[PDB]
Design an enzyme around this catalytic site. Structure first.
Site, PDB file in Angstrom:
ATOM      1  N   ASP A   1       0.791  -1.221   0.000  1.00 24.25           N
ATOM      2  CA  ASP A   1       0.000   0.000   0.000  1.00 24.25           C
ATOM      3  C   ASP A   1       0.832   1.285   0.000  1.00 24.25           C
ATOM      4  O   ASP A   1       1.360   1.687   1.040  1.00 24.25           O
ATOM      5  CB  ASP A   1      -0.903  -0.033   1.235  1.00 24.25           C
ATOM      6  N   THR A   2       0.913   1.963  -1.143  1.00 27.86           N
ATOM      7  CA  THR A   2       1.721   3.200  -1.235  1.00 27.86           C
ATOM      8  C   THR A   2       1.105   4.423  -0.546  1.00 27.86           C
ATOM      9  O   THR A   2       1.769   5.422  -0.332  1.00 27.86           O
ATOM     10  CB  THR A   2       2.057   3.565  -2.677  1.00 27.86           C
ATOM     11  N   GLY A   3      -0.168   4.347  -0.195  1.00 28.30           N
ATOM     12  CA  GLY A   3      -0.820   5.434   0.519  1.00 28.30           C
ATOM     13  C   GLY A   3      -0.794   5.223   2.024  1.00 28.30           C
ATOM     14  O   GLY A   3      -1.536   5.885   2.772  1.00 28.30           O
TER      15      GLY A   3
HETATM   16  C1  LIG Z   1      -1.247   9.655   6.687  1.00 29.29           C
HETATM   17  O1  LIG Z   1      -2.354   8.767   6.819  1.00 29.29           O
HETATM   18  C2  LIG Z   1      -2.000   7.479   6.540  1.00 29.29           C
HETATM   19  O2  LIG Z   1      -0.924   7.133   6.059  1.00 29.29           O
HETATM   20  N1  LIG Z   1      -3.023   6.617   6.845  1.00 29.29           N
HETATM   21  C3  LIG Z   1      -3.039   5.358   6.132  1.00 29.29           C
HETATM   22  C4  LIG Z   1      -4.335   5.366   5.356  1.00 29.29           C
HETATM   23  O3  LIG Z   1      -5.428   5.308   5.898  1.00 29.29           O
HETATM   24  N2  LIG Z   1      -4.092   5.459   3.990  1.00 29.29           N
HETATM   25  C5  LIG Z   1      -5.087   5.744   2.983  1.00 29.29           C
HETATM   26  C6  LIG Z   1      -5.972   6.946   3.296  1.00 29.29           C
HETATM   27  C7  LIG Z   1      -5.318   8.190   3.816  1.00 29.29           C
HETATM   28  C8  LIG Z   1      -4.103   8.631   3.350  1.00 29.29           C
HETATM   29  C9  LIG Z   1      -3.549   9.784   3.861  1.00 29.29           C
HETATM   30  C10 LIG Z   1      -4.171  10.542   4.834  1.00 29.29           C
HETATM   31  C11 LIG Z   1      -3.557  11.790   5.309  1.00 29.29           C
HETATM   32  C12 LIG Z   1      -2.406  12.275   4.710  1.00 29.29           C
HETATM   33  C13 LIG Z   1      -1.876  13.463   5.163  1.00 29.29           C
HETATM   34  C14 LIG Z   1      -2.497  14.132   6.200  1.00 29.29           C
HETATM   35  C15 LIG Z   1      -3.635  13.588   6.747  1.00 29.29           C
HETATM   36  N3  LIG Z   1      -4.176  12.441   6.320  1.00 29.29           N
HETATM   37  C16 LIG Z   1      -5.393  10.090   5.294  1.00 29.29           C
HETATM   38  C17 LIG Z   1      -5.950   8.933   4.793  1.00 29.29           C
HETATM   39  C18 LIG Z   1      -6.026   4.575   2.740  1.00 29.29           C
HETATM   40  C19 LIG Z   1      -5.414   3.179   2.757  1.00 29.29           C
HETATM   41  O4  LIG Z   1      -4.681   2.972   1.546  1.00 29.29           O
HETATM   42  C20 LIG Z   1      -6.509   2.112   2.964  1.00 29.29           C
HETATM   43  C21 LIG Z   1      -5.907   0.784   3.351  1.00 29.29           C
HETATM   44  C22 LIG Z   1      -6.901  -0.324   3.495  1.00 29.29           C
HETATM   45  C23 LIG Z   1      -7.042  -1.256   2.488  1.00 29.29           C
HETATM   46  C24 LIG Z   1      -7.946  -2.293   2.600  1.00 29.29           C
HETATM   47  C25 LIG Z   1      -8.725  -2.416   3.725  1.00 29.29           C
HETATM   48  C26 LIG Z   1      -8.577  -1.488   4.733  1.00 29.29           C
HETATM   49  C27 LIG Z   1      -7.674  -0.450   4.626  1.00 29.29           C
HETATM   50  N4  LIG Z   1      -7.421   1.915   1.853  1.00 29.29           N
HETATM   51  C28 LIG Z   1      -8.772   2.170   2.007  1.00 29.29           C
HETATM   52  O5  LIG Z   1      -9.317   2.500   3.054  1.00 29.29           O
HETATM   53  C29 LIG Z   1      -9.535   2.003   0.716  1.00 29.29           C
HETATM   54  N5  LIG Z   1     -10.212   0.718   0.872  1.00 29.29           N
HETATM   55  C30 LIG Z   1     -10.978   0.329   1.944  1.00 29.29           C
HETATM   56  C31 LIG Z   1     -11.394  -0.920   1.733  1.00 29.29           C
HETATM   57  N6  LIG Z   1     -10.882  -1.314   0.537  1.00 29.29           N
HETATM   58  C32 LIG Z   1     -11.115  -2.620  -0.037  1.00 29.29           C
HETATM   59  C33 LIG Z   1     -10.555  -3.784   0.736  1.00 29.29           C
HETATM   60  C34 LIG Z   1      -9.317  -4.316   0.424  1.00 29.29           C
HETATM   61  C35 LIG Z   1      -8.828  -5.388   1.146  1.00 29.29           C
HETATM   62  C36 LIG Z   1      -9.600  -5.897   2.162  1.00 29.29           C
HETATM   63  C37 LIG Z   1     -10.826  -5.315   2.416  1.00 29.29           C
HETATM   64  C38 LIG Z   1     -11.718  -5.819   3.508  1.00 29.29           C
HETATM   65  C39 LIG Z   1     -11.114  -6.971   4.288  1.00 29.29           C
HETATM   66  C40 LIG Z   1     -12.068  -4.660   4.413  1.00 29.29           C
HETATM   67  O6  LIG Z   1     -12.922  -6.302   2.937  1.00 29.29           O
HETATM   68  N7  LIG Z   1     -11.312  -4.277   1.724  1.00 29.29           N
HETATM   69  C41 LIG Z   1     -10.129  -0.309  -0.039  1.00 29.29           C
HETATM   70  O7  LIG Z   1      -9.524  -0.314  -1.101  1.00 29.29           O
HETATM   71  C42 LIG Z   1     -10.369   3.252   0.419  1.00 29.29           C
HETATM   72  C43 LIG Z   1      -9.514   4.483   0.656  1.00 29.29           C
HETATM   73  C44 LIG Z   1     -10.823   3.224  -1.017  1.00 29.29           C
HETATM   74  C45 LIG Z   1     -11.634   3.376   1.236  1.00 29.29           C
HETATM   75  C46 LIG Z   1      -2.801   4.151   7.037  1.00 29.29           C
HETATM   76  C47 LIG Z   1      -3.596   4.193   8.310  1.00 29.29           C
HETATM   77  C48 LIG Z   1      -3.153   2.866   6.327  1.00 29.29           C
HETATM   78  C49 LIG Z   1      -1.345   4.122   7.427  1.00 29.29           C
END
Ligand SMILES: COC(=O)N[C@H](C(=O)N[C@H](Cc1ccc(-c2ccccn2)cc1)C[C@H](O)[C@H](Cc1ccccc1)NC(=O)[C@@H](n1ccn(Cc2cccc(C(C)(C)O)n2)c1=O)C(C)(C)C)C(C)(C)C
Lengths: 99, 99
Positions: free
Chosen positions: A25-27
């Protein structure tokens, strides 16, 4: 190795001599791992995320193997739905976006 | 371009005649952007996240130029900290994870 993104980049890993699966996960700033137990000591902490926050247990200096490549780094352990490998370890193994 | 990961892969994009910064997020299924207005009709939708779901508006056949690359697809509008560009659109600009 090179990974397209048509499916989810689910790679396999080894921590604590255990086989786990994780998302590349690059984000993700930080690496966040599912409920499991780890040696060494730890600070609690809140991590950001799309909607709302969770308590992660923070383990520094964890040896982890992502997909054949050794890396050492901070690891966050908490109520996440999947094992997430963030930038902090992705760098370590020379992972890079390429289009 | 080749983007190493020592910092957030924040890039520049174009949607509805606007320029915005967005994160290139390989652990995101979809593309979700901050509150903005866009043409056409939308469905309600929820998105998983780390710490819980948020209400989003779903738009289709939306045009985004990402980093000079033209693409089309489903975009989600809602209360997100940053414009996240997901796989639904990264595949389109030919994006791939490399190590
Ligand atoms: C700085 O903040 C930061 O680094 N937070 C991170 C974070 O939240 N990153 C970004 C977000 C982010 C980034 C930066 C900031 C930020 C940056 C600067 C300042 C302030 N905020 C805030 C949020 C989203 C992240 O990539 C998540 C990871 C994830 C993936 C899968 C499941 C849960 C979590 N992606 C999502 O939330 C996306 N999402 C959600 C579900 N899915 C499908 C999926 C895949 C695999 C498994 C499942 C399950 C089992 C649940 O069925 N579902 C999916 O793809 C979504 C975003 C589309 C909803 C981490 C907490 C992960 C470290």
């Amino acid at each position: 190795p090179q990974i397209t993104l048509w499916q989810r980049p689910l790679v396999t890993i080894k921590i604590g001599g255990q086989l786990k699966e994780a998302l590349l996960d690059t984000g993700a700033d930080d690496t966040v791992l599912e409920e499991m137990s780890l040696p060494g000591r730890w600070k609690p902490k809140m991590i950001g995320g799309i909607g709302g926050f969770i308590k992660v247990r923070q383990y520094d200096q964890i040896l982890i193997e992502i997909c054949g490549h050794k890396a050492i780094g901070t690891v966050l352990v908490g109520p996440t739905p999947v094992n997430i490998i963030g930038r902090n370890l992705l760098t370590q193994i020379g992972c890079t976006l390429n289009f």
